[PDB]
């Protein structure tokens, strides 16, 4: 009874997340296809994505439970096909701002993806269901990265054709969302629900901040003329680590009633220690290994957080809880990015940035490590 919704949802996730053109977005926009200068891309186009994402995260989490999750998944599919038909056939800055608006709509609707399944599956299959859907997305992303790299390098394929392949993938993903079965008809009071949400908000803010400066750190540590290939390979390998880590959460048999905190504390230290390893160490290989541990360790916890939050929800407010925690994550990221990186703030270089990122995650582990009063 739990097989059909899981299968179709995981097919939709895999096909939607498999987009080869993602790693080659900046080269595509500034390349000979559009010629959007670096200043334009970095100042008038990309920032629009954050604000559209933040604004559209409000209706999504306010109205994803009332209208059942399917409607939102279908809207996400339609938004995907327009982000990419406008990236394929869009020229100008205004058109790219509109594409960033539609991509903010796309990414703000992902709450319905992770909230839908618990509304159609029995509670006893919340553990297995949680792992599969998270893993299929990471496996899809790594597959897309590898395919794009091989095609560009070993076959000489222009970025336009990577965009065409991603468009086909997202269209095939949308074609599946029309078959998902339709479900049938202040919750933070619980400590377990609330405290897994506190990690979600703060930890997710730090994660998305690191991802934008890992590669710059590698350039600073080991300046090389072939760093581009090594940069891509490590990113794809790091994601595959998350896929196996998230998949193992829903496969290995363990009692999560008493191991809920222990995993949070134990694996919250690993995320701080790994970041301290990237910044401090001079070896570039150990810096590659630190990134794997950091990404895979985090993807392990986001699977338990979603599984454990949904277990303790008395009401069927899955999109509300998931959508408020991802909204506050953007709030922390946006405010904390201005303080640290933006010239208006501190203007820290990449050399010392990861001591703040590693120290930021150290506090998060500190709060949970200190939850012992005797």
């Amino acid at each position: 009874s739990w097989i059909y919704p899981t299968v179709i949802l995981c097919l939709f996730g895999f096909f939607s997340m498999m987009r080869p053109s993602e790693p080659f977005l900046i080269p595509y926009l500034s390349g000979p296809d559009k010629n959007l200068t670096s200043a334009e891309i970095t100042n008038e186009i990309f920032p629009v994505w954050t604000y559209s994402y933040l604004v559209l995260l409000l209706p999504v989490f306010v109205l994803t439970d009332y209208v059942r999750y399917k409607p939102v998944i279908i809207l996400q599919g339609i938004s995907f096909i327009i982000t990419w038909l406008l990236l394929l056939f869009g020229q100008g800055v205004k058109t790219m701002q509109v594409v960033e608006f539609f991509y903010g709509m796309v990414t703000a609707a992902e709450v319905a993806y992770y909230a839908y399944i618990y509304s159609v599956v029995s509670p006893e299959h919340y553990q297995r269901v949680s792992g599969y859907c998270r893993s299929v997305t990471l496996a899809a992303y790594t597959a897309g990265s590898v395919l794009a790299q091989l095609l560009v390098s070993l076959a000489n394929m222009s970025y336009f054709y990577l965009n065409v392949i991603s468009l086909a993938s997202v269209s095939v993903a949308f074609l599946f969302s029309l078959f998902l079965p339709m479900p049938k008809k202040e919750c933070y009071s619980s400590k377990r629900l609330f405290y897994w949400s506190l990690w979600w908000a703060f930890a997710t803010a730090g994660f998305n901040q690191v991802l934008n400066y890992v590669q710059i750190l590698w350039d600073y540590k080991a300046p090389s003329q072939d760093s581009s290939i090594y940069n891509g390979a490590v990113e794809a390998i790091a994601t595959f680590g998350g896929a196996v880590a998230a998949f193992a959460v829903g496969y290995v048999k363990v009692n999560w009633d008493l191991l809920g905190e222990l995993a949070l504390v134990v694996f919250s230290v690993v995320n701080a220690g790994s970041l301290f390893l990237m910044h401090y160490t001079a070896n570039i290989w150990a810096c590659y290994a630190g990134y794997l541990i950091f990404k895979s360790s985090y993807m392990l916890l986001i699977t338990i957080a979603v599984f454990q939050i949904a277990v303790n929800l008395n009401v069927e407010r899955y999109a509300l809880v998931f959508g408020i925690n991802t909204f506050i994550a953007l709030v922390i990221q946006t405010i904390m990015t201005v303080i640290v990186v933006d010239q208006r703030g501190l203007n820290l270089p990449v050399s010392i940035q990861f001591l703040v990122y590693g120290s930021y995650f150290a506090v998060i582990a500190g709060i949970f490590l200190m939850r012992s009063m005797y």
Partner: nanobody, 128 residues
Framework: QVQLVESGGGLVQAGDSLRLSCAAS????????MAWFRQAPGKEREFVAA????????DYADSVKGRFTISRDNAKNTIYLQMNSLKPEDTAVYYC?????????????????????WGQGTQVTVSS
Amino acid sequence: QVQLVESGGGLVQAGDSLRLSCAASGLTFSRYDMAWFRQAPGKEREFVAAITWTGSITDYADSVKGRFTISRDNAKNTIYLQMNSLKPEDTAVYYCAAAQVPYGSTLKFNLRTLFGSWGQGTQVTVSS
């Protein structure tokens, strides 16, 4: 505001050598990719050279390659360009530019749409 002033242009016999300098000020020089452009008398500005912010990559125009070597000095916030075996077609006014975004090379920004904030130019007249 980023200011760039070039220094080194002049009149040199054919086959002599020159070493242009461009002392940048107003930005963290140790993050921005720098480049040299020229504007020959009768054409538009063209790319001549660029050196990544790490200093490990040096892209050159197909014409200059084998005679020009771009150099940078993050200690003095200065960028240089050694011209050797100057041919009569090297006549131009050389401008030094800076990437509009700090880590242009790392993010794979196209080089031909990355440099702005031009300088004031310096006349190089290589005569036969």
